[model samples]
Target: STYADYFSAWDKWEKQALPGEERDEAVSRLKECLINNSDELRLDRLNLSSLPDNLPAQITLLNVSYNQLTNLPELPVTLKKLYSASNKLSELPVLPPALESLQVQHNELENLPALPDSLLTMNISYNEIVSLPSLPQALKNLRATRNFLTELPAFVVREYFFDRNQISHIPESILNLRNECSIHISDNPLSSHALPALQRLTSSPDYHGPRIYFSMSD
Candidate 1:
């Protein structure tokens, strides 16, 4: 899509934003440009350093994986799914509450932000995050594999995925969740004697299913 057309459409709609002729025209044009051809918009490895200022707001799924983007532009409020893996982004954009799934693995992010409450699944693996903050209460699936985390967050011990990280000891806060959660902590620097603690957490009745896969790399 041409940036000029998108910018002009936004400018025209801003003057009459409340369901007028210009607003409907721009929305219709954006819907046609994005939603009508949504299946062909996977522009991975495109090397986009920054997002265009006037992106289509109707975009629901976006995959900008393996790019060089350092900062994201204002995200679309209607976005439901996004994948920005293996980029240079140090942080996330202001996500809308309508977001359902987000994958931002293998980046330079060092801290977790307060996520939107509507998120169902998220993947923030292979970054530099040291600790996870209290996640939104509505999350169902989380993946935080391979980072500098030394301990898992206390509130998120239920059916979560965490492996290949720099963790050496499972904290007592995590051990307290053995009755109601399933955890995976393989490929870490833990000892064989800690297997009992790992198994105890994974074998609980409330624990759905947990698997730990291990591998060593020099």
Candidate 2:
């Protein structure tokens, strides 16, 4: 069947959203999607406190950021990239298996669900997370700044922006990452004992290795 037929099934679901001027905007957005038959939906800044469980299955990229969403509905299996940043979400729903990018920064999440194996990038900075679950093998870029984390995970990511946390030590797993890892750890309470190891790693033969950033005056 054509893409129009696929969206027609979605149009039959009863939609739910908050009441405001942006709610009208959400209506027009769906109409625009119906006319264009696009697989992406952007409903940002709608003051939306909730989402209809029956989101269009054909949508792959969804952006519902800068709103008052306290919780999210079950995501569509076809979703790939999701942006739900700047919300009041204390928790997240189960993620789709095929998802790749997730940007949930500036929320109230205490923890996250299991990372999808297909996920490549994530930004969960500015939350109350005390610890993180196991990271996916495919994760390449991670931004988890301004949290309650006490230690780092052993994932082999290319970019790690975890500045402004409670981390005290750098694990060998991160210091000896196989590739060029750009790590930022400014404004942390790192232990003095880890300095010698860090200094040696910086002076190692490989000049093009991990780029570690930290402040000594802290």
Candidate 3:
């Protein structure tokens, strides 16, 4: 809460804030602190509204958490994982071709970009995501825990697991699956119609859990 308040009042600081006058100076100031290894860069808790316009070309893992940044520039071609949680970002750079993991939690994003085919894990929790776009086939872990999500893609692979959201319907895509995938929809505002479909998923071997979230033992 204190950090949020600091940025809420960061406007006064912005008036006097001066990012490097040129791209060279910005990169130069940042490079002076380049204790980074061959494949990663960690620039956490800088409390800056802006970062250097360009990043080093070979960097792969980039973590820029706990800032007030609203946007980022294009990333390098070799990027694989990008961690930029707890910022005010509304958009992302074009995800790199080799990108496999992305963590963008707790931001002001209203929408997201197209997922690259190479992504395997993506956590966009605690944002303003309204609807989901077509996802990639390689995604194994997708955690959108708290958001404004309502609709789901008509057909998906692997599983359909959600809880604590606003979903109220289960499309036939999920209902029609016969013990091939999983479904766990608890704590949402579901109509009675979803109950039977949930029952259908309950019979599946990979069913995630019981219909509700309660922990009581005998």
- The most accurate candidate by lDDT is 2
> For each candidate, what TM-score against the reference?
0.70, 0.83, 0.71
Please identify which of the two predictions, 2 or 3, would achieve the higher TM-score against the true structure: 2
Local error of candidate 2 at residue 82 (angstroms): 0.3
- For residue 118, model 3's alpha carbon misses the true position, in angstroms, by 0.3
lDDT per residue for candidate 2 within 1-218, as digits (tens), equals 35565445334332433346265566567667656767999989877776645566678999999988899888889899999999999998999989999999999999899889999999999998889898888888999999889998866548888899999887777756645788888778887756665677676886545788776533
Q: Against the hidden true structure, what lDDT does model 1 obtain?
A: 0.69
Candidate 2 deviant stretches above 4 angstroms: 1-21, 193-209, 216-218
Is candidate 1 or 2 superior in lDDT? Answer: 2
Q: What would the per-residue lDDT of candidate 3 be over residues 85-197, giving only the tens digit for each residue?
A: 99999987778977998899889888888889998888887888888888888987677767777855664344444555577665556546454445445656677655565
Q: What are the per-model C-alpha RMSD values against the true structure?
A: 8.6, 3.9, 8.6
Question: What's the CA error at residue 29 for candidate 1, in Å?
Answer: 14
Off by over 4 Å in 3: 1-29, 32-37, 156-161, 176-184, 192-218
Ten residues in sequence with the least summed lDDT for candidate 2: 9-18
lDDT of every predicted structure (CA atoms): 0.69, 0.80, 0.66
Each candidate structure's count of clashing pairs: 0, 0, 0
